[PDB]
Nucleic acid binder design. Structure first.
Lengths: 119, 271, 70, 88, 101
RNA sequence: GUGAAAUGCGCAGAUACCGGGAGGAACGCCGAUGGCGAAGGCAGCCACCUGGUCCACCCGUGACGCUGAGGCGCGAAAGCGUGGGGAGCAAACCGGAUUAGAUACCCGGGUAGUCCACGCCCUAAACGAUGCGCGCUAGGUCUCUGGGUCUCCUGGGGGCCGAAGCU
């Protein structure tokens, strides 16, 4: 049905798993994938190879709804993060630009114990 | 402030009374507007229909103003803060420039000598009354109408308030003293500030008379009666309800919701 | 490379409204910059930041900006 | 705070001979003024313990001195205390 | 009295009339709390670092004044009542302190 | 989510993305081997009230000093009382893991409590494990903060290396 060639793609890479969601120019998703969306399940989902496979499987679906160029936007450290970007530039999408918007408190609310290892 | 007493008697050990700083310099109520004799009477056409009500000090009624939009634009000076037997909040007698006098349920902060006024024009300060639209989103406010021109229904218990939460067309979102979130019409007036005499919650009645002075008769437990008398009633020596707690009338009283399902009041409420 | 105090003239680090002067003290992450980069003194770097903060609060300076091509 | 004027007026009002900026009698009346001003403050901000410390330090000073003053001179010891209102 | 630099940020999307009202109310306000107007610089509408009140613009007013220290807090409150006045900032005035001195 | 898992959440439409709103806590960068405070301790911005401290000018008082049994005040966190708040985190508590066992360590929840006010409590590796005041006895090095007819000289404070000496 609907098609747009110029959209936008968000990369969530956690220390566990990497998941890409592709949107329109104002952020309303068109499709997504992730290390779970591939045959991988568990802590292999956090692997960069899976972040790739996702990134391709993700792109490949957007193309089908007319996609060609997208702006890339990352949030959060994680093995698979880099391979994710890499996997999109050489893929058939024109990575019109990249941003990092990993969110980060200005000394916000107290984190869990595991994270509060920073004294 | 709550006076606490020394224990020169049991019971007078736990009893605490109000400060009356509150009101000072005015006790005898306003013969003029104030009084209609109030009618004690704990039921309708014969039968008691609120149990345990009766006795308690003979009491005169003060006729307050719950619709301030009569006097739009006319300011009045706050003339005195006086005692009201008929409600938890205290009341303020205020003389309008108009000559005319009336009693408002006295909001917190309010002090003898202040001038106070109601209208869309009014300054956004204590005791002044205004449509809800012309009141800034965030302020607390009490003595709120619910439908326009129907009189102040919300937030009049001692130390109560509501807070303006948002706008929405002719309507305006309100967080109630309960915690409920309700749209109320923009034209529904409300008086800026909260209610005051907010120590009221902390009176420790102190003994069982007193409870009587306030006209509250003793309340006999369910089990404590016999089966004719009540659902819990019965049982040889002392008993454990025997499923699941119930009013005298039988309907369940632990957790059962009672408000009418298809009420058109719905769609306006959200908590 | 570039020390930022040396790259301006006489300037009043007390003015929480010289956006142009101040803008240059703010990374491309919007952060306050260190003395490793401003090259203000101790005492300066303070009377600086305090005004940088204010200016953020006035709506002149960003508290943070996100990071363009990384 | 305590202004330049309020300060001076007290000083020129308690001197031994115009120009006298120190002196037992004046030093006292300085603190007294600071104290009451401070006294007055802690009465609102009861929770300000830090500033209370200083008061207790002055209070001593005042004492310290008054004891000197009294030792050398009973005459203008009454004068001061009475024309100033202390001894509790 | 102490010297103070008033900052007030108003709605951008205002007809100059309402904008004048608001600014005329501010004069009363300044006036009533004991504020002698000294300077005043109307740098007017400006683009914002981040959206205030859904708007990436805003109309600014600086004001030198001399007033009694005590009532200032109140002025700032009285200046904030208004729906259109989105920011207010009082600041004790102290003369420029220059680098590359 | 982990070590790998599982509990758990999700087609009743979650995670990922966007917009609109609510609420509470803590203030990134600046920020440091930095500063302030008698100590405990004190960190977004603004205004008001208020304590201690430092430098300079050699003007005033004229030994008015030091210490301090007892008294009096302050005293982190936890905990207590009354009432408000409760997003995040989290003793107890429960689930999943692991293990011989696991009343733990790891994971999913979670109640007090954490926060506000008011009043109690009075402890601590309350540690520099070094009571207070004064005088005297090489210097080197970097740092915060003041004063100078400002390659430097002088005063106050914070670290490092070390004469004599002590151990």
């Amino acid at each position: 049905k609907r098609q747009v060639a110029s959209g936008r793609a968000y990369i969530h890479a956690s220390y566990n798993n990497t998941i890409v969601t592709i949107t329109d120019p104002d952020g309303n998703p068109i499709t997504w994938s992730s290390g779970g969306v591939i045959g991988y399940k568990g802590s292999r989902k956090g692997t960069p190879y899976a972040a790739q496979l996702a990134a391709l499987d993700a792109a490949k679906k957007a193309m089908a709804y007319g996609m060609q160029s997208v702006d890339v936007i990352v949030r959060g450290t994680g093995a698979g993060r880099e391979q994710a970007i890499r996997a999109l530039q050489a893929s058939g999408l024109q990575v019109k630009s990249i941003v990092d918007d990993t969110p980060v408190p200005h000394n916000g609310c107290r984190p869990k114990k595991k994270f509060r290892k920073a004294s | 402030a709550v006076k606490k007493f020394k224990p020169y008697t049991p019971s007078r050990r736990f009893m605490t009374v109000a400060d009356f700083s509150e009101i000072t310099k005015t006790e005898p109520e306003k013969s003029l507007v104030k009084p209609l004799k109030k009618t004690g009477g704990r039921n309708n056409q014969g039968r008691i229909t609120v149990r345990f009500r009766g006795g308690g000090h003979k009491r005169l009624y003060r006729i307050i103003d719950f619709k301030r939009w009569d006097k739009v634009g006319i300011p009045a000076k706050v003339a005195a803060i006086e005692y009201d037997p008929n409600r938890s909040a205290r009341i303020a007698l205020l003389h309008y420039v108009d000559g005319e006098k009336r009693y408002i349920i006295a909001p917190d902060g309010l002090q003898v000598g202040q001038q106070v006024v109601a209208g869309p024009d009014a300054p956004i300060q204590v005791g002044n009354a205004l449509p809800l639209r012309f009141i800034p989103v965030g302020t607390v406010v009490h003595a709120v109408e619910l439908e326009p021109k129907k009189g102040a229904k919300l937030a009049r218990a001692a130390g109560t308030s509501a807070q303006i939460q948002g706008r929405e067309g002719d309507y305006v979102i309100l967080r109630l003293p309960s915690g409920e979130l309700r749209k109320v019409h923009g034209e529904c007036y409300a008086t800026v500030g909260a209610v005051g005499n907010a120590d009221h919650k902390n009176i420790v009645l102190g003994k069982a008379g007193r409870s009587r002075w306030l006209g509250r008769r003793p309340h006999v437990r369910g089990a404590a009666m016999n089966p004719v008398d009540h659902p819990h009633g019965g049982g040889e020596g002392r008993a454990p309800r025997g499923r699941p707690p119930a009013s005298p009338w039988g309907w369940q009283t632990k957790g059962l919701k009672t408000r009418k399902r298809r009420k058109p009041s719905s769609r306006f409420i959200i908590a | 490379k570039a020390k930022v105090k040396a790259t301006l003239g006489e300037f009043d680090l007390r003015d929480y409204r010289n956006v142009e002067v101040l803008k240059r003290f703010l990374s491309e992450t919007g952060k306050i910059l260190p003395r490793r980069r401003t090259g203000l003194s101790a005492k300066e770097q303070r009377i600086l930041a305090k005004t940088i903060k204010r200016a953020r609060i006035l709506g002149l300076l960003p508290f943070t900006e996100k990071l363009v091509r990384k | 705070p305590i202004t330049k004027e309020e300060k001076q007026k007290v000083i020129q009002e308690f001197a031994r001979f115009p120009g006298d900026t120190g002196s037992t009698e004046v030093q006292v009346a300085l603190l007294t003024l600071r104290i009451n001003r401070l006294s007055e403050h802690l009465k609102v901000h009861k929770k300000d313990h830090h500033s209370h410390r200083g008061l207790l330090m002055m209070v001593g000073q005042r004492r310290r001195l008054l004891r000197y003053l009294q030792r050398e001179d009973p005459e203008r010891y009454r004068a001061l205390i009475e024309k100033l209102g202390i001894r509790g | 009295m102490r010297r103070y630099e008033v900052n007030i940020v108003l709605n951008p999307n205002l007809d100059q009339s309402q904008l004048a009202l608001e600014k005329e109310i501010i004069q009363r306000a300044l006036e009533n709390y004991g504020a002698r107007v000294e300077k005043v610089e109307e740098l007017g509408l400006r683009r914002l670092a981040y959206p205030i009140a859904k708007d990436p613009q805003g109309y600014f007013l600086w004001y030198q004044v001399e007033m009694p220290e005590d009532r200032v807090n109140d002025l700032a409150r009285e200046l904030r009542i208004r729906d259109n006045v989105r920011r207010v900032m009082v600041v004790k005035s102290q003369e420029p302190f220059l680098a590359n001195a």
